[PDB]
Design a protein around this ligand. Structure first.
Ligand SMILES: CCC1=C(C)/C(=C/C2=NC(=C\c3[nH]c(/C=C4\NC(=O)[C@H](C)[C@H]4CC)c(C)c3CCC(=O)O)/C(CCC(=O)O)=C2C)NC1=O
Ligand SMILES: CCC1=C(C)/C(=C/C2=NC(=C\c3[nH]c(/C=C4\NC(=O)[C@H](C)[C@H]4CC)c(C)c3CCC(=O)O)/C(CCC(=O)O)=C2C)NC1=O
Ligand SMILES: CCC1=C(C)/C(=C/C2=NC(=C\c3[nH]c(/C=C4\NC(=O)[C@H](C)[C@H]4CC)c(C)c3CCC(=O)O)/C(CCC(=O)O)=C2C)NC1=O
Ligand SMILES: CCC1=C(C)/C(=C/C2=NC(=C\c3[nH]c(/C=C4\NC(=O)[C@H](C)[C@H]4CC)c(C)c3CCC(=O)O)/C(CCC(=O)O)=C2C)NC1=O
Ligand SMILES: CCC1=C(C)/C(=C/C2=NC(=C\c3[nH]c(/C=C4\NC(=O)[C@H](C)[C@H]4CC)c(C)c3CCC(=O)O)/C(CCC(=O)O)=C2C)NC1=O
Ligand SMILES: CCC1=C(C)/C(=C/C2=NC(=C\c3[nH]c(/C=C4\NC(=O)[C@H](C)[C@H]4CC)c(C)c3CCC(=O)O)/C(CCC(=O)O)=C2C)NC1=O
Ligand SMILES: CCC1=C(C)/C(=C/C2=NC(=C\c3[nH]c(/C=C4\NC(=O)[C@H](C)[C@H]4CC)c(C)c3CCC(=O)O)/C(CCC(=O)O)=C2C)NC1=O
Ligand SMILES: CCC1=C(C)/C(=C/C2=NC(=C\c3[nH]c(/C=C4\NC(=O)[C@H](C)[C@H]4CC)c(C)c3CCC(=O)O)/C(CCC(=O)O)=C2C)NC1=O
Ligand SMILES: CCC1=C(C)/C(=C/C2=NC(=C\c3[nH]c(/C=C4\NC(=O)[C@H](C)[C@H]4CC)c(C)c3CCC(=O)O)/C(CCC(=O)O)=C2C)NC1=O
Ligand SMILES: CCC1=C(C)/C(=C/C2=NC(=C\c3[nH]c(/C=C4\NC(=O)[C@H](C)[C@H]4CC)c(C)c3CCC(=O)O)/C(CCC(=O)O)=C2C)NC1=O
Ligand SMILES: CCC1=C(C)/C(=C/C2=NC(=C\c3[nH]c(/C=C4\NC(=O)[C@H](C)[C@H]4CC)c(C)c3CCC(=O)O)/C(CCC(=O)O)=C2C)NC1=O
Lengths: 162, 172, 160, 237, 159, 162, 162, 172, 159
């Protein structure tokens, strides 16, 4: 799992040398940054049920296909729509994890590590999630600087999808 | 790696005498049955990904703790590892179907396989639930006759049901 | 004439009864009549599409449809479509009869006289019948396309 | 069976002691050890950096990676040195490198990808060439990994890496795995069809006018023939 | 097919030649298969018109486009009613065994009718081709061959 | 590129030993089926334009989505429909190549080698091609034994897609 | 141990891919051969004592040297002549093993794997066995096709000896 | 590695169009001629060591400087290397016989082979003397009828004389 | 060679004299070697055109020089296409056994054609000589003799 503190560790450990001043400034940058990221963390957990059910409906509006045709892949049945809030409910968790971690670490392992191999099997088209996140990109309602950094991890998961 | 041809050799080598004409006539089934072996593996590997993804909805049908949060098949890397191991049995099964004797499956698939589930934490006995939930789809795809000339394919289907039964019993 | 009628005629002018070679010929015709009828049905399906594809393959965008060519005037274009429809229809009749005598009797009788009287180009007609043959051999399959191409090449060879 | 003929080792960067462990620049490669796993993303980094030395980044693909070997490495059943052997003795390596490369070229490429060291001179490439031809390719790869230059320097459980590349070009970029008169007359045929002159009454003269008018046709209505209810929809009079 | 042989032998002063009696006896034998094919196409009509409209409007979208004729719900309902008419005439030709009672009602003056209605005839031919494909999927092999017979006649007639 | 003759070569070359009787029987087997696969090869090239335009329309019937929504990925424009016959026109080429090669060799390199990485980028959903091939699986019209072996390479490309 | 079935396995296992059609045709060829090879197998075991004592005397006729001079290497004593039927009795076993295995597998491991190192030590001259087998090559009495394939494994052991 | 089946593929792939029925009928010789390929390689490798040692007495018959003291094939290590390379051509020849096209022999046997004789000092042109002194023994063993039913393999045989002629010309 | 004897005995009112029948029987016997030689020259065409262009442009560099005719990629492609044509006619003459179907297509009016194209004929003769040398290296001794026969006819004809 990646973290700008643990990047200062593993780069110092493979060299076999101590923690010089050139790794402490790496940790130092994150501390200033973390306070800012936590304001984006409180902005998302307060809007948990608002963003999920807003973005889940935002998929069905642009894609009326997945609500109609029968199949285990789509969400014509309620168990598809129940698993709809499973995925996008799990997407906003790791985005809130990646902001509090300060890095792309938990977003790397938990979400995008094997994501290109599941979607080839279960017929989950990645254009579904990539525009689910675009609704979260526009409707999180954050402002200031934390609106940019919460926007950073969203379109990092987009480039992993596409 | 062994065979039905080379286990007969090694059975005769440990005796150390020439093969009898009684022995070779029983082996002459296999050159006749090699017509029947060679397409039942071709039937499985043609529909290999259909068996895996349909039986991925069967272990996950009955035991919904696996995509429960905190489950062992829970996260995306873990679930991609489930599919990584859902067909790692099928190649080792279809190797034993072509070879005809399970000494390939027993030193590459099941040799110490049970040991890792006591090491990692993943439930061993749950894999044995879903593996014989493949064989009802594996036999059911290999048995039905559409197009192909009618034949007694029943005889080695009991072999195919035996190899899944061996591999499921030596996991859980 | 038929293949049946040709076999009966060849047995008749000798005063011969139906010997075993003639019965072999008739039984071969009765074997091939299945694909003969199926080929004639699917050629009767889309004859206009075959003629359209053939002129789009061979005759279109040449100098023949340009002014100075023989297909410039629109009545001459309609006469071209009529002649190609005739070639395809009589080739269908000769395919189902299994004997090219109706091509010799109804199409190839005084046709070079007419085409040299009107100034119709013969080589472009031969290439158009060739494109007809390729299109219908693709459309019907190889096994009946051989017998279709035999009578279309018969028309092409008698025309030249 | 015959011993290797004695050949000429040239002077190179690897031979030098390069004394100390505080002294190296950062550019020295991150020597991924299987012993310091820490978290999954060091396993994923160890596996990916093994592929990179062997396949030069672009290849990873999907098909090329033996998925089974990666799983075993995490478990620890097979050492990393055993794993690169299984990568080099793979046919996804064999159809990639060996089928395109010469025998003498293959010595230079395999020494740069498995041993991280360029070939000394040409006669070192000639000396090992005989070994590949009689033992087989997996006879030679198994002779590299067992060799004393590999086991002292890379140890049991380190991915290989270019050593002492301070004044050199990275091996993957510098060296790759690679090594028609009728076409030019056919393009002569296409250029001589455009140069005559379009004949009078052509379709191309009015083509420019069509572009000027524009007007892409109308889009599809979208009403479906299953929901038209045509028996009720027809009106009398 | 009996009227065909009767007017055929009626133009001549001769009786019905017994080869024609053989073909009438064979048609009388095959009439049961003809009736089963016609009933199978009968009871499943709305499926065939649905799949024909499907394949046609996927193939040619200009009838859907507002410059085309079948624009709007009323015009597309008239379009599927025309396809229903042609399926009905195909069932008539399947029972009658010869294409006279279907050409007499659907073929013999269709080009000038569709010309003075504005609709193209090639789209109607593609619609009957879609009907033939859907009925080929609906029937068995020897039934789809014998249905695609008369469907093929209609497709050749509309062109 | 893989071939049962060239599998008898490379397995004999890495061992560093001659062509024994245990590699000649590998090429012997291909010869027996060589005649059989070529009958499937003639069955496909005669139906080139019939199978391609049949399967391309078979995608649009089950998927009315890709014909309607604007975008560079789908085929609303004619250039999409022009590139429709590019892909499925290229799919039937390598299937006819894999039958004449006797192995999955040219199908491995030309088609499925990097196929899992393009479709993650260009939003080409692999469920489009996997049911395009199912129409070719049913409508090739082949019979006898060659109908089975032409059916073999089709659902080998299916398992590479899914 | 090598077998054209197990060559289709190990080539499929190092690639890490399934049993495609390009390995099933490898096992197809062996089956045709197996019926033919078994007719050579019955031809040799029926003539077990005839071929061994025929070829053992065939060594002494061309080589009168090994029957006369004293030494532990040669067969002047009866224990040499007792070990004469040991070796050529063991030679015809693995030839009958290699025919039923369909490959050069058991002939590789059981006979010719360390054969070049024993004969340098025990003074067993390999020209003795190489002309022992030539008598078996001529006097097996087989006919048809099985006479060729039984002739194949004999002069495969010859090239390993010389 | 290439084939007569896969060069036809790569010839058609660089055109990029389906194979014609004119093309496949010419390829239908090879499935008939595969009966004739498969034993002419089996004839060579059965008598492989007899060809090498008899042609070791032919280059050394005509050019006795090679076991002269100071020669390049002189010492025991060097002479064992001659036999090490006297049949390293025969496996690469018999690979090209089975494959039917010489792209295996041209990237593994002859690719840069001439370069080493200018490097070591061993005479390049002398190997080209003894290599086509193998083919008169190779063709002469592969052509004579004994046991096998009479058939015309002359067309196939020219191919075998062409591969030795290619390999000898690209050495010296 | 059969047309040669037939028109030879046809100018006379006599039949084919049986010595001509002996030469036809001997040509019929040698036809298999002729077919093998023609197929060996057939499948290896691009090698022969490559080595012929090699040896020609090494021998005469004026076609490469801009005053010569074969200057540029298009003109040098036309040059190698001419060499391909002459190799094709040589294979025709190898099968036919006598030089009539190759002289009828490549020899009988070649001097005025190459004169009104600007190209020299001696360079074409050197190109066919290079083709003969490359085919002599490609074939065995009795095959290269019988190929150099017709190649020799072309070289004598172009001069
Ligand atoms: C913790 C991070 C994490 C996520 C997000 C995740 C998603 C995920 N969603 C899945 C299936 C699914 N995903 C969806 C979701 C959707 N399909 C639709 O139709 C909609 C367009 C869309 C929701 C907006 C559905 C309906 C299924 C079930 C599909 C099936 O069973 O085939 C599957 C495979 C089967 C499963 O265990 O349930 C995974 C692994 N897994 C993870 O480990
Ligand atoms: C549904 C249960 C069932 C099965 C499984 C079945 C298979 C089956 N495969 C057969 C034949 C065969 N099957 C194959 C198949 C192949 N050979 C190869 O070398 C290829 C690699 C492979 C295809 C990829 C061949 C070549 C034959 C020869 C006989 C025939 O043409 O049917 C036959 C002919 C009759 C017999 O063997 O007794 C049977 C029974 N029949 C059944 O009733
Ligand atoms: C059943 C056998 C049969 C044939 C073929 C036939 C042909 C025929 N073609 C004619 C004219 C024509 N035929 C052609 C046809 C062609 N010119 C071209 O450039 C093309 C190469 C070719 C079309 C493929 C044209 C252009 C005319 C018009 C001459 C004119 O009327 O001014 C005419 C003069 C009168 C008229 O068309 O109504 C006859 C009789 N009659 C027959 O009974
Ligand atoms: C066994 C044969 C052999 C030799 C000789 C050899 C030399 C060698 N000398 C090096 C550097 C160097 N060599 C020198 C040498 C000198 N500076 C001076 O002023 C003097 C004139 C001169 C020494 C007398 C310097 C200063 C460097 C470092 C240059 C740099 O890093 O920019 C390096 C790069 C760093 C390293 O030591 O690994 C190598 C590989 N390698 C070999 O395998
Ligand atoms: C109930 C459904 C279900 C399954 C099946 C499942 C499998 C699963 N297999 C795993 C690892 C693994 N699984 C294997 C399996 C194998 N290695 C081989 O070579 C053989 C082919 C094969 C054994 C037959 C190996 C080696 C690992 C660990 C690989 C590594 O960590 O490097 C992991 C990683 C972490 C952990 O185990 O706790 C999971 C979650 N999880 C689930 O929820
Ligand atoms: C697969 C293609 C291929 C070939 C052919 C090849 C040849 C090759 N021949 C070699 C040596 C040699 N080759 C010979 C050969 C000969 N001496 C004679 O008198 C004869 C004329 C001739 C053999 C017929 C000798 C004597 C040496 C050792 C020379 C020395 O060490 O000075 C060597 C250096 C040592 C070694 O064997 O590794 C190579 C690499 N390598 C290849 O990859
Ligand atoms: C049983 C014999 C029979 C036929 C053949 C027939 C045709 C027929 N088609 C009509 C209209 C129509 N027909 C169509 C046809 C089509 N939609 C298209 O785009 C395609 C070209 C085609 C069908 C797929 C359309 C669009 C109209 C309405 C045109 C209008 O209102 O002007 C009308 C006028 C309205 C009516 O009274 O139904 C008649 C009479 N009527 C008959 O009784
Ligand atoms: C020789 C084997 C081979 C194949 C088959 C192949 C396909 C292939 N199709 C592509 C795009 C495409 N593929 C399609 C095809 C489709 N999209 C749809 O909407 C339809 C559902 C479907 C056709 C039935 C389209 C429309 C594009 C352009 C998409 C874009 O530009 O974003 C691309 C990326 C861009 C390109 O170069 O054109 C590749 C690489 N490449 C290969 O090398
Ligand atoms: C890969 C293992 C393998 C081999 C080796 C093999 C060889 C082989 N050669 C055969 C035939 C034959 N092989 C030859 C070969 C020749 N006759 C001559 O006089 C020439 C000198 C020479 C060619 C240069 C002939 C003439 C036949 C006759 C039968 C046929 O046409 O196949 C046949 C026909 C079937 C049989 O003999 O039972 C076999 C099996 N088959 C196999 O499966
Ligand atoms: C510099 C060290 C060195 C030695 C010693 C050596 C020996 C040697 N002796 C040979 C042959 C031979 N060696 C002998 C010698 C003998 N055969 C007998 O019958 C007698 C018992 C015995 C002598 C006492 C004979 C007669 C030949 C020729 C055999 C043949 O041509 O097959 C050969 C193979 C052919 C050759 O080049 O002549 C070598 C390499 N080579 C070396 O490089
Ligand atoms: C099969 C019977 C046959 C012959 C003989 C033949 C000759 C022929 N040579 C031509 C051109 C040419 N031919 C050459 C010839 C040469 N390059 C040189 O320098 C040498 C003198 C010589 C060949 C090595 C060149 C350079 C041109 C192009 C000249 C130009 O463009 O004016 C052309 C005109 C362009 C064309 O349509 O190809 C013809 C017709 N064509 C035939 O169909």
């Amino acid at each position: 799992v990646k973290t700008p503190i643990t990047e200062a560790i593993a780069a110092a450990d493979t060299q076999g040398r101590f923690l010089g001043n050139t790794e402490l400034q790496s940790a130092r940058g994150r501390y200033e940054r973390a306070a800012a990221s936590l304001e984006a963390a409180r902005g998302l957990t307060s809007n948990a049920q608002r963003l999920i059910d807003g973005a889940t409906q935002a998929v069905y509006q642009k894609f009326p296909y997945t609500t109609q045709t029968p199949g285990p892949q789509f969400a014509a049945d309620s168990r598809g729509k129940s698993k709809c809030a499973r995925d996008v409910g799990h997407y906003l968790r790791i985005i809130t994890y990646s902001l509090v971690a300060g890095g792309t670490g938990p977003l790397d392992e938990y979400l995008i590590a094997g994501l290109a191999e599941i979607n080839s099997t279960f017929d989950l088209s990645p254009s579904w999630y990539v525009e689910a996140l675009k609704h979260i990109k526009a409707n999180h309602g954050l402002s200031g600087q934390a609106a940019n950094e919460a926007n950073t991890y969203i379109d990092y998961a987009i480039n992993a999808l596409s | 790696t062994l065979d039905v041809f080379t286990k007969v050799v090694s059975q005769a080598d440990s005796r150390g005498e020439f093969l009898s004409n009684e022995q070779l006539d029983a082996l002459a089934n296999v050159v006749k049955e090699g017509n029947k072996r060679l397409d039942v593996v071709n039937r499985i590997t043609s529909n290999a990904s259909a068996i895996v993804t349909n039986a991925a909805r069967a272990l996950f049908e009955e035991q919904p703790q696996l995509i429960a949060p905190g489950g062992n098949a829970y996260t995306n890397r873990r679930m991609a590892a489930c599919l990584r191991d859902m067909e790692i049995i099928l190649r080792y099964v279809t190797y034993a179907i072509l070879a005809g004797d399970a000494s390939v499956l027993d030193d590459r698939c099941l040799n110490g396989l049970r040991e890792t589930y006591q090491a990692l934490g993943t439930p061993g006995s749950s894999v044995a639930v879903g593996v014989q939930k493949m064989k009802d789809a594996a036999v059911g795809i290999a048995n039905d006759p559409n197009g192909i000339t009618k034949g007694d394919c029943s005889q080695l289907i009991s072999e195919v049901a035996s190899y899944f039964d061996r591999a499921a019993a030596a996991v859980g | 004439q038929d293949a049946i009628t040709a076999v009966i005629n060849s047995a008749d002018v000798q005063g011969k009864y139906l010997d075993t070679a003639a019965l072999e010929k008739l039984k071969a015709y009765f074997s091939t009549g299945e694909l003969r009828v199926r080929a004639a049905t699917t050629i009767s399906a889309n004859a206009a599409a075959i003629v359209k594809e053939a002129v789009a393959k061979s005759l279109l965008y040449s100098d023949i449809t340009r002014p100075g060519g023989n297909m410039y005037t629109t009545r001459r274009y309609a006469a071209c479509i009529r002649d190609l429809d005739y070639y395809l229809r009589y080739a269908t009749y000769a395919m189902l009869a299994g004997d090219p005598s109706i091509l010799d009797e109804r199409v190839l009788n005084g046709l070079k006289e007419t085409y040299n009287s009107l100034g119709v180009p013969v080589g472009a007609t031969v290439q158009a019948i060739q494109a007809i043959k390729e299109v219908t051999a693709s459309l019907v399959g190889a096994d009946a396309g051989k017998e279709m191409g035999i009578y279309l090449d018969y028309i092409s060879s008698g025309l030249s | 069976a015959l011993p290797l003929l004695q050949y000429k080792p040239s002077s190179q960067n690897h031979r030098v002691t390069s004394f100390g462990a505080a002294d190296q620049n950062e550019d020295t490669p991150y020597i991924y050890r299987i012993e310091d796993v820490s978290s999954y993303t060091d396993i994923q980094n160890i596996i990916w950096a093994s592929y990179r030395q062997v396949f030069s980044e672009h290849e990873i693909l999907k098909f090329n990676r033996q998925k089974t070997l990666e799983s075993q490495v995490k478990n620890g059943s097979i050492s990393v040195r055993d794993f690169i052997r299984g990568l080099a003795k793979s046919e996804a390596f064999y159809r990639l490198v060996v089928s395109v490369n010469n025998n003498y070229r293959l010595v230079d490429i395999t020494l740069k990808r498995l041993l991280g060291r360029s070939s000394y001179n040409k006669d070192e490439q000639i000396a090992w060439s005989i070994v590949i031809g009689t033992k087989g390719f997996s006879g030679f790869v198994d002779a590299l990994i067992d060799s004393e230059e590999y086991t002292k320097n890379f140890g049991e459980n380190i991915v290989p890496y270019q050593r002492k590349r301070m004044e050199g070009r990275p091996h993957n970029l510098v060296t790759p795995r690679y090594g028609d008169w009728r076409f030019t007359l056919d393009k002569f045929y296409s250029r001589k069809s455009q140069e005559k002159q379009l004949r009078e009454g052509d379709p191309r003269k009015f083509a420019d006018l069509a572009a000027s008018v524009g007007n892409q046709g109308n889009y599809a209505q979208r009403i479906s023939a299953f929901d038209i209810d045509y028996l009720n929809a027809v009106p009398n009079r | 097919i009996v009227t065909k042989s009767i007017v055929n032998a009626d133009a001549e002063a001769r009786y019905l030649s017994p080869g024609e009696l053989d073909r009438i006896k064979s048609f009388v034998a095959g009439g049961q298969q003809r009736l089963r094919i016609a009933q199978a196409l009968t009871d499943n009509r709305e499926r065939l018109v649905k799949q024909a409209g499907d394949q046609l409007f996927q193939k040619r979208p200009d009838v859907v486009s507002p410059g085309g004729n079948a624009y709007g719900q009323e015009m597309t309902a008239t379009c599927l009613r025309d396809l229903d008419y042609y399926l009905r005439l195909v069932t008539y030709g399947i029972v009658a065994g010869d294409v006279t009672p279907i050409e007499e009602i659907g073929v013999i003056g269709v080009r000038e009718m569709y010309k003075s209605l504005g609709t193209p005839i090639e789209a109607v031919g593609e619609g009957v081709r879609a009907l033939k494909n859907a009925a080929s999927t609906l029937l068995s092999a020897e039934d789809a061959a014998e249905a695609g017979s008369y469907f093929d006649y209609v497709v050749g007639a509309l062109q």
